[PDB]
Each structure stands twice: as structure tokens, then as C-alpha cells.
């Protein structure tokens with residue numbers, strides 16, 4: 079069956095050394111795996127959803143503005159996809175199976191039309207990749223669970239700034255959400 | 269109390285003579301009232317949400333594609349706001365209290381972040397304007413009702429192709445949704 | 459594949475002569491068709507969801523309280539299913555494919571777990587029956603549309619007190635929601 | 648200023664020594680604080696929502712069935728509120744400001760009418776209590792955040808079976824959700 083891979087916030091501001099809200103080394107370490115798994119999913123016929131923070135510096139009505147420094151600002155290089163994943167987007171961004179969705183909350187579902195697009199395509203399984211494991215990925219996974227999706231987490235293609243938080247989230251995915259943990263070849267991990 | 273005015277699909281494709289899905293004369297007849305009530309709402313400090321159909325011609329996954337001819341296509345003049353309402357947007361579009369939201373369903377809430385933006389601002393009352401009364405306006409109103417908003421309908425600033433459908437919708441707003449019917453001066457109608 | 463039939467508000471208070479918010483004769487006229495189509499859907503292996511108004515008197519926080527007289531009050535006979543449809547529920551209510559869901563808004567989806575139950579079963583098509591065509595049925599249909607369900611409307615198994623409103627709703631289902639209008643044999647009209 | 652206290656899954660099966668899915672001693676340890684803070688909120692005129700797991704044996708369509716042993720089964724003692732909280736419910740459950748809501752997912756919002764009831768009362772702040780901090784409480788908190796509620800967490804009135812998961816969740820509430828941590832007297836903890 080055809081699935082959907084969700085690419086969560088893997089942008090310059092979350093990954094690069096000078097990124098405004100960078101997760102640093104652990105985020106950079108998944109660059110090869112996240113691009114590889116995305117290409118693999120696309121090649122086999124899956125839908126690809128880039129779900130990307132789209133913030134505005136002067137937005138005092140957003141509770142998040144008080145919690146983190148400005149990041150992924152609309153019209154800035156901070157929103158550019160990091161590494162070879164960006165090259166994949168140059169090659170296939172205009173394809174009918176590839177989507178770019180701006181989001182304001184951590185979850186890829188919140189205030190977006192992600193659920194609608196998935197339901198149009200009768201997709202029952204989402205495959206999650208990106209950063210941070212315990213924030214945008216976690217919120218997306220919980221929303222996916224409540225919306226009745228089967229969930230796959232690409233373990234080597236998610237990362238957090240805190241190793242303990244990364245480990246909590248992975249445990250939560252498997253034990254509470256019943257997610258399948260998979261590698262960069264989309265093979266289950268035992 | 270600060271309210272929000274929702275401006276629904278009042279574009280060239282729904283209003284102009286040559287509009288791809290035009291409501292024709294009844295839609296054109298509300299041009300003065302819809303621009304007047306929007307400027308009045310903006311001047312008093314209300315939030316203004318332009319919630320506009322954003323369709324793609326090649327979208328075989330959208331059930332609406334089979335129901336209506338192509339309308340409000342991306343990058344076309346069909347998506348331009350009709351009359352003085354368009355002029356108002358050119359003057360005040362970049363103001364912090366004015367919003368543009370692309371939508372794919374009839375309802376202004378479906379797959380958008382309208383509810384999120386309204387709740388950020390603690391808005392309890394929505395004021396509905398636009399076309400068509402029995403489709404995009406009706407769906408928006410029903411969603412607003414289920415989301416617990418108080419509803420105001422600007423009767424002289426909503427219109428449909430079918431008079432019987434326009435009349436059904438107005439009756440539904442008042443008797444089933446408990447909406448207040450108001451004029452272009454935002455005064456209740458008796 | 460396996461579809462779900464939604465049975466909307468077909469209770470004493472909406473149908474019977476003495477019903478608190480009765481649609482009267484037009485609602486009573488669909489009794490045979492609504493019971494027949496529900497029994498048919500169940501025989502075909504479909505899921506059946508009874509989605510029924512569950513109101514409380516003196517619920518001042520509900521906006522509907524000011525719009526309609528008290529109806530379908532919790533613990534009252536007004537919530538009893540009307541006619542042979544009630545007999546069907548007595549017979550098959552304990553079956554794993556048959557559900558009873560209390561609702562407070564007109565739409566069967568609003569504040570309920572209907573969508574969750576349907577998605578658990580990977581249901582892609584809902585079949586709508588009940589009353590009123592232009593209120594609870596219409597709201598349920600619109601929610602179903604926005605939630606990406608294919609929709610079937612059993613034309614002889616929906617009713618309103620207002621003929622013009624019933625007609626509007628049927629047109630809206632077909633032309634705006636892209637719903638299939640079907641008969642009591644579940645054949646397209 | 649009228650708030651709503653949410654009492655999440657504080658029942659025999661999650662708390663009692665012989666509970667089917669018991670969090671054990673840490674859950675038992677909060678019994679005094681959770682009952683005290685609930686009685687306080689009620690005295691202050693707040694709404695009280697008991698949001699309680701309602702599961703069925705042989706519910707093969709529920710993904711949770713494969714993740715945890717049977718717990719909080721409808722019609723069983725497992726669903727009984729633990730400690731003085733249960734006594735409070737006997738005393739005041741029939742009050743108009745006190746609600747009992749059955750739920751099937753971890754989040755108190757998922758498939759329930761919680762949001763609807765809160766919006767009816769124009770509640771803007773939810774106060775969270777119960778178990779487990781990193782499951783039902785966490786999911787409820789994340790849903791509350793996405794739905795635009797201000798969040799208070801009663802720190803001494805939430806618990807998990809795993810202390811490290813409790814710590815993660817508390818950090819997540821404060822740093823990611825912008826929640827206020829409060830004590831059993833509803834005073835902010837600094």
C-alpha cells in the first residue's frame with residue numbers, strides 16, 4: 079500500500095551551526111539518513127509532505143514567541159531544507175506527490191490541511207522524520223495517533239538537542255503510540 | 269468587544285460577469301455593502317479574515333473538481349477580490365489585523381488555521397460576509413456554530429445564484445444556528 | 459467495501475404525534491423505509507451507528523436551548539427509537555457492529571467519537587438516514603464531507619417538517635457534497 | 648476568570664496496588680494533593696471535569712488493546728476514582744459544575760465533547776491533574792495547547808510510574824507548552 083512520509087522542520091534554523099534554534103551535531107548527524115529515506119519513499123510511490131515552521135518575528139499573539147527565540151522566519155534562509163534533502167526538493171518539489179505545508183504549531187496537523195490531503199489519498203500509514211524528536215515530531219505523532227493513522231518512525235532520521243528527550247520520545251512512540259521503529263531503508267528495527 | 273469579520277470568496281471568479289463560477293447579478297449587487305461593512309469593521313478595530321478558495325486544475329484528488337468547473341485557480345486574476353473590497357486589501361492587507369487564508373473546502377475553517385487565530389485573539393463572535401450564502405457561507409457558519417462562536421450574518425453582504433437557496437440559508441442561520449442577522453452598518457435587523 | 463449506516467435522531471420526540479419536537483407525518487412516513495434499509499445494511503455486513511440527541515433541561519450553556527423546546531431529554535421516553543427501527547435495536551444492539559452514540563449538537567460528529575470509530579474500521583463511505591434532513595442530517599453530511607467520507611443519502615429514509623428545506627438539503631447533498639442519492643434497497647436513484 | 652480543573656484517570660486500575668495497569672506508589676503518593684486541589688478548585692467556583700478511560704475487553708479495533716493489558720473496563724471497579732477524590736465525586740458529582748466524561752484515547756479531548764463544554768463556558772484556562780504524567784496528562788496537555796488554552800499543571804497532583812518520564816513531561820509542559828506549574832494551593836511554583 080502507498081504511504082506518506084512526513085518531513086518535519088529539517089531546515090537550516092534547526093540543523094546548521096548558525097541556525098537560530100539549532101539542535102547542532104545530533105541534527106546534522108541524521109542528514110544522510112533523512113535524505114536517503116525520503117528518496118526511497120518517493121521512489122516507491124509514497125507521498126512526501128514537507129511540514130515546515132513558518133514564523134513571524136512580530137507575532138505577539140503566538141504563545142511560542144515567548145518560549146523560543148525567532149526561528150524559521152517567513153522569507154529567510156532559515157526555512158531552507160538542510161543537506162541533500164534540499165537537493166531532493168529541487169528535483170521533485172513540483173511533483174504532484176510532493177507537498178510543502180507551512181505550519182505555526184509544533185504538530186504538522188495543527189491548523190494545516192495535512193489530514194485532509196492524507197484522507198483524499200486514503201493513506202492509512204504515516205512515516206515520520208525530522209526534528210526535534212520530543213517537540214515537532216512528538217506532537218505530530220500524537221496527533222497522527224488520535225487521527226487513527228498507523229505510524230512509522232525512522233529512528234536514524236529523527237533527532238533532538240537532548241539525548242534523554244530523544245530517548246523518551248522514541249520509547250513513547252513504540253510503547254504508547256504503537257509505532258513501528260524503522261531504519262533508513264524503511265526496514266523495521268528489532 | 270473585539271470581533272472578527274470573515275470575508276468569504278468575494279473574488280472575480282464568483283462575482284464578475286466573466287467569472288468562472290460567477291453568481292452574477294445578485295453577487296454584484298452586494299459589492300457596495302460588503303466593502304462598506306468590511307471598512308466599518310476594520311475602522312472600529314475588528315480582525316478581518318479573507319478566506320479564499322485556492323484551487324488547482326489538475327487536482328483529481330479533490331472531490332470538488334467533479335462538481336464545479338475550474339475556479340479560483342492559483343496565480344489567476346479569478347482570485348482577485350472584487351470591487352472596493354480589493355482596494356481595501358491593497359491599502360490594509362499587510363496590517364497585523366488583516367489576514368489572507370487560502371482554503372480548499374467550502375468552509376473557511378476546514379484545513380485552515382482560522383480557529384487557531386481566532387482563539388489566539390480570544391474572539392467569541394464572527395461576522396460572516398461573502399458568497400455563496402448556501403455553500404461557502406453556510407459551511408463556514410455551521411463550523412463556527414460547532415466551534416462555539418457567536419455568529420453575525422451581514423444579510424445585505426451575502427448572496428447566492430439561487431434566491432430560494434439564499435432564503436433557506438438565512439432561515440437556517442437564524443433558526444438553527446441562532447445567528448444575529450445584521451445590516452451593512454452592523455445593526456441588528458428586525 | 460464495508461460501509462457505515464448512520465441513523466440520525468429517529469426517536470419518539472422527533473417522529474411520534476406526541477413528540478416534543480415532532481416532524482409529524484413526513485417523519486412517520488419514512489418509518490418503513492428507514493427500518494428496511496437499516497436491516498438491509500446490517501445484513502450486508504455494514505456498521506450501524508445510532509447517533510441520538512441527548513439533551514438536559516435547564517442546560518443554559520447550550521445555545522440550542524434558546525432555539526428549540528426541550529426534546530430528547532436524557533432518561534425519558536422521547537429518546538426511544540421510533541417504530542421497527544427500535545425493534546431492530548432491541549434485537550441487534552449488542553452486536554459488535556451496532557453502536558449507540560449520544561450527541562449534543564445537530565451533527566453526529568460534533569463532540570462525539572464517530573470519526574474515531576469509523577477510522578478504526580477504515581470506513582470510507584457513510585450512509586445517512588433520519589431526521590431532520592435540513593438540520594441533523596445536513597450538519598452530519600457536511601461534517602462527513604469535510605472529513606473526506608464518501609456519502610450516500612437514503613432519500614426515502616430522510617425527512618423534514620418543511621418540504622422546501624428537505625428539497626434544498628437533497629440538492630445540496632448531490633450538487634455540493636457529491637453524495638449519491640439511494641433508495642431503501644441501497645440502489646442509486 | 649472561571650477555570651476548569653481536569654481530573655485525568657485517577658482510578659483504581661491506575662493507582663491502587665492491585666490495579667490492572669497501576670502506576671503504584673508514585674500515583675498513590677499524590678492522593679492527598681489531588682483530592683485537596685480538586686476540592687479547592689470546586690470551592691473557588693471552577694468547573695471540574697473527570698475524564699476517565701472507558702475500555703472494553705475484546706475491542707480488537709482499538710490500537711491500545713495490543714499495547715496495554717485490559718484496564719478501566721466499563722462496569723468494573725477499575726474505573727472507580729481513588730481516595731478522597733472518589734468521596735468528593737459521591738458528594739458533588741451531581742453538581743452542575745462537575746462532569747464525568749468517558750474517553751477511549753489517552754487525551755481527554757480526543758473523541759469527547761470537552762472542548763465544546765469549555766467553549767460553552769468561555770473557559771480559557773485548564774488546570775491538569777492525574778495520571779500518567781507522560782501519557783494521558785501529556786496528551787491532554789498537548790491537545791489543550793493546540794486548542795489555544797492557557798495551561799496550569801498541578802505538579803504535586805500528577806504522577807507517572809517512571810520518575811524520568813514524569814520529569815520529561817514536567818519540562819515539556821513548562822518549556823514547550825508554556826504551562827504554569829502550580830501547587831495544591833493553586834499557587835505558582837518558581
Ligand SMILES: NC(=O)c1cccnc1
Pocket residue numbers: 086087092099131146184209210211212213214215
Ligand atoms: N522543530 C521543532 O521541534 C521545534 C522546536 C521548537 C520550536 N519550534 C519547532
Ligand SMILES: NC(=O)c1cccnc1
Pocket residue numbers: 276277282289321336374399400401402403404405
Ligand atoms: N464560494 C462558494 O460558495 C463556492 C461554491 C462552489 C464551489 N466553491 C466555492
Ligand SMILES: NC(=O)c1cccnc1
Pocket residue numbers: 466467472479511526564589590591592593594595
Ligand atoms: N434532529 C434534528 O434535526 C434536530 C432539530 C432541532 C434540534 N435538535 C435536533
Ligand SMILES: NC(=O)c1cccnc1
Pocket residue numbers: 655656661668700715753778779780781782783784
Ligand atoms: N492514564 C494513562 O496515562 C494511561 C496509560 C496507558 C493506557 N491508558 C491510560
Ligand SMILES: [Zn+2]
Pocket residue numbers: 131133142149182183
Ligand atoms: Zn517553531
Ligand SMILES: [Zn+2]
Pocket residue numbers: 321323332339372373
Ligand atoms: Zn471552490
Ligand SMILES: [Zn+2]
Pocket residue numbers: 511513522529530562563
Ligand atoms: Zn437537539
Ligand SMILES: [Zn+2]
Pocket residue numbers: 700702711718719751752
Ligand atoms: Zn487506557
